[PDB]
Amino acid sequence: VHWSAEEKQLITGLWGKVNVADCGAEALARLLIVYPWTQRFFSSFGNLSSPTAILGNPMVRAHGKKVLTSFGDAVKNLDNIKNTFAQLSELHCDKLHVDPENFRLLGDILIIVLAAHFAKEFTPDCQAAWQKLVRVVAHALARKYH
Amino acid sequence: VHWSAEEKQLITGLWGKVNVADCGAEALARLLIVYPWTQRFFSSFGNLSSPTAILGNPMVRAHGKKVLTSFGDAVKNLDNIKNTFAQLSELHCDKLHVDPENFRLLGDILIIVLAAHFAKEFTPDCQAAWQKLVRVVAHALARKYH
Amino acid sequence: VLSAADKTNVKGVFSKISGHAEEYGAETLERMFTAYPQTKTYFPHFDLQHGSAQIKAHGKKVVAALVEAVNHIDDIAGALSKLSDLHAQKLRVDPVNFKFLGHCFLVVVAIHHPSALTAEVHASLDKFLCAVGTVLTAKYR
Amino acid sequence: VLSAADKTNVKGVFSKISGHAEEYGAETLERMFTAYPQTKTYFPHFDLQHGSAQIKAHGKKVVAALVEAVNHIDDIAGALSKLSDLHAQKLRVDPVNFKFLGHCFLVVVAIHHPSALTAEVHASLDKFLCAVGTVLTAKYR
Ligand code: HEM
Ligand code: HEM
Ligand code: HEM
Ligand code: HEM
């Protein structure tokens, strides 16, 4: 993909502010809550019996931040995502067999979460920049199926 | 992508039997009938007022075979689809702005059509081979959006 | 929701395949595993070798249920409430796989009753399956 | 279909945004055109420059309708029958775009009432929108 000089600006700045801990937890939680079927891939996390029972789960919260800091490597070299996630695509594709449709799903929630934490600093241009990032990442994860 | 030696066999043989005229028409027709919204991109075809009013439309039938013979170039060099459809992806992406989701849709109908014309000669292995082709083609058409 | 016509067409094409549950169900399943291999993930405990007794038995059950839904095509939810629990709450089946199964089913009908699957029915059948698949995961709706 | 809870949650978060149709509608629209540019294709006749009177007027209309649907959250179809004609039969809006608009809407609520959009409501809102979008293209169901 091609990244305009501002797109990078927009992304790396916001990155510096992001609390991967809170955002990451908030996101993985919401994914499990809104799209229930995703719970299947996290049977190893014990209780997911209820929404509120999920916000608290520390395994959810832990993995949440782990997933989010991966984007840290994306922002690292926005012109090398494919190669930096091949191994990541490999397990999600050949191992877990996650349907690419869920990558899209998570990416969307992630956007909403950022919008709630940076309020008015999450400008339309900014939203678009992350939308793009989120998709170019999922395309790097998918790919392994083609 | 990687094509097993039989996948190619399975594909090129069936290709030789295919009546692009009937199949192509049958297909584009069904797409318009099952997923109505697609009609929007074919406003230039006049009447599409009814199912039966569509089977007959000669513009539908004409374009139907045109779309199907394109697969002829696919079968041509199953290891070069991307480069051979770049110009095809360009108009579908930058020009018409067809959402990739419809490429999937058409590909599916195409499969069903073949299954009705070759009956029991359309073996599971054969279905899988075309499924693959159909998807690797749509991925070549999409791509232009990423 | 399914219109009157949609209901009529669905009933029609099912009249032609009735008496083949065993055979067709087994075929759509085998085509699903063959073209959408990742769907295998849901049947570790299944004998997947072509023409297995399991696949046949299950095949028959699957279409038997779709048939059951046609008889109560006015209350698909009620008719399959017990199965939506199973596929949604229990197995947590990804809504995406329901597409693969419906697809293969249409392929099977096309091969054996190409005259029964006119384009009009094709659309009625498609709305039927999205409706069914909705309910079967629909717990989320 | 929407459960009792889902209905309650939807009503709740709409109580907090009510009195902002004009403002929010305009914002979700602008975010949609900005992040999903291809959606522009449907408004050649629109003044798309940020903060345009058209976008504001339409924005207001859009949410005004979503609100209307909440008041009749028991018969969304009836409530929007006239609009499903428009978006389905007339404009032939690709069902895929309804996703883009609902997404942006949630982004707008998140930015202004982050407390009002708890994860529970988030799910209720999501089922509401898929329901609405279904009906608005649903002519095909
Ligand atoms: C593009 C978004 C995503 C990114 C960046 C991502 C990233 C990661 C990372 C960094 C790991 C590392 C290995 C580990 O700690 O286990 C992981 C594991 C995993 N991911 Fe994701 N993931 C994404 C989307 C998804 C989705 C949508 C699902 C499906 C519900 C999923 C399911 C899993 C599972 C089940 C594991 C195994 C974790 C474990 O071993 O407990 N991921 N992911
Ligand atoms: C992968 C499947 C597809 C292939 C192989 C394909 C191929 C073609 C070809 C070969 C043309 C050549 C130029 C021409 O004769 O106009 C064409 C034009 C076009 N295609 Fe497709 N197409 C595909 C899917 C779609 C879908 C899903 C739609 C959307 C409803 C679509 C809409 C069009 C339109 C509107 C044109 C313009 C035709 C005209 O100018 O009258 N195509 N396509
Ligand atoms: C509308 C299509 C479908 C129908 C009507 C359907 C129906 C059924 C039925 C009737 C059973 C019950 C067996 C019994 O209790 O005797 C069942 C079980 C099950 N279904 Fe499906 N199903 C459909 C789609 C799916 C899909 C998309 C998948 C997976 C890709 C799936 C996975 C399963 C699994 C794994 C079981 C396991 C039962 C066992 O352990 O033998 N189903 N389904
Ligand atoms: C649930 C979300 C949506 C709602 C409730 C909605 C509602 C409306 C309303 C109320 C109007 C009527 C204007 C009037 O008659 O005064 C309208 C018009 C229209 N809608 Fe939407 N809409 C939605 C989604 C979409 C989407 C996804 C698109 C396009 C990407 C779209 C494209 C249009 C267009 C182009 C018109 C044109 C009206 C004009 O010429 O000014 N709508 N919509």
Where do the domains of chain B lie? 1-146
What is the total residue count of chain D?
Answer: 141
Question: Which residue from B111, B105, B113 is spatially nearest to B133, judged by alpha carbons?
Answer: B111
Q: Cα–Cα distance between B55 and A44 in angstroms, integer?
A: 53
CA atoms within 13 A on the CB side of A8: 9
Residue C135: phi and psi, rounded to 5, are: -50, -40
- Radius of gyration for chain B, computed over Cα atoms and rounded to the nearest angstrom: 15
Per 3-state DSSP, chain A is made up of helix, strand and coil in percentages (nearest 5) of 80, 0, 20
- Radius of gyration for chain A, computed over Cα atoms and rounded to the nearest angstrom: 15
CA B96 to ligand 2: nearest atom: 35
Please check whether residue D80 is in contact with residue D135, taking contact to mean a CB–CB distance below 8 angstroms.
Answer: yes
Instruction: Please give the helix or strand (H or E) that residue B55 lies within, else none.
Output: helix B51-56
Please check whether residue A134 is in contact with residue A3, taking contact to mean a CB–CB distance below 8 angstroms.
Answer: no
Q: Cα–Cα distance between A24 and A27 in angstroms, integer?
A: 5
Technique used: X-ray
To the nearest whole Å, the CA of D19 is away from the closest chain B CA by 34
With a CB cutoff of 8 Å and minimum separation 6, the contacts of B50 are: none
Q: Is the CB of C80 under 6 A from ligand 3?
A: no
User: How far is CA A13 from each of CA A7, B88, D48, D97, D108, rounded to the nearest angstrom?
Assistant: 10, 38, 28, 30, 21
CATH number of the domain within which D118 lies: 1.10.490.10
Resolution (A): 2.8
Find the A44 Cα to ligand 1 centroid distance in Å: 13
Contact A127 D107 (CB under 8 A): yes
Owner of token pair 């859009």: D62
Superfamily assignment of B1-146 in CATH?
A: Globins (1.10.490.10)
What's the domain range around C41? 1-141
To the nearest whole Å, the CA of C22 is away from the closest chain B CA by 17
Find the A102 Cα to ligand 1 centroid distance in Å: 11
Please check whether residue A64 is in contact with residue A119, taking contact to mean a CB–CB distance below 8 angstroms.
Answer: no
Q: Domain tally for chain D?
A: 1
> Which tokens go with A138?
């999922």
Find the A67 Cα to ligand 1 centroid distance in Å: 6
Q: Mutate which of C38, C55, C107 to disrupt the B interface (most B C-beta within 10 Å)? A: C107
Owner of token pair 């209309």: D61
